[PDB]
């Protein structure tokens, strides 16, 4: 499913991401935009053989099992394919574990390079939340 900007903001807010670990909703919408263009089916392969999945591009090297990333962890206890669902619950629950591991949203390279230090509130402007 390809989300609309406001539709995704509302779904993330309902799933408890607004101000989760001090990150306002605009940060999460901004990260989803540059990681996946709001497409839950997005996949991208990394140089090390691991793959990134879903709306927040969660990596199989640490967070999910895809059956093809040797010596990797599955810290979210889920198959990577569950992160491609039109229901964002699994992606959101896994992102909460990632953002709590010590590095905050810096775990998402696109957030650090394209969202951090910008007016992220603009990503939720006009939304009925
Ligand atoms: Na915001
Ligand atoms: Na591979
Ligand atoms: Na980047």
Residue numbers in the entry: 1 to 129
Reproduce the article's own wording on this structure:
Here, we describe the new and innovative design aspects, fabrication, and experimental implementation of low-cost and micron-sized X-ray-compatible microfluidic sample environments that address diffusion-based crystal formation for crystallographic characterization. High-quality X-ray diffraction data were collected on protein crystals grown directly within the chip, with an exceptionally low background recorded on the images, a clear advantage of the devices while performing in situ macromolecular crystallography experiments.
In the current experiments, Lysozyme crystals were confirmed to grow directly within the channels of the chip, reaching dimensions approximately the width of the channels 14 h after injections. The structure of the Lysozyme was solved by the molecular replacement method applied to the recorded data merged from 21 independent crystals. The MiD design and conception allow for minimizing the background noise originating from the interaction of the incoming X-rays with the material composing the chip (Online Resource 1). Consequently, the flux deposited on the in situ crystals could be lowered to 3.8·1010 photons/sec without affecting the quality of the diffraction experiments. The final structure of the Lysozyme did not emphasize any markable conformational changes amenable to X-ray radiation damage, resulting in crystallographic statistics of good quality. Overall, the 1.83 Å resolution electron density of the protein is clearly defined around all amino acids, including at the disulfide bridges, a classical trademark of radiation damage.
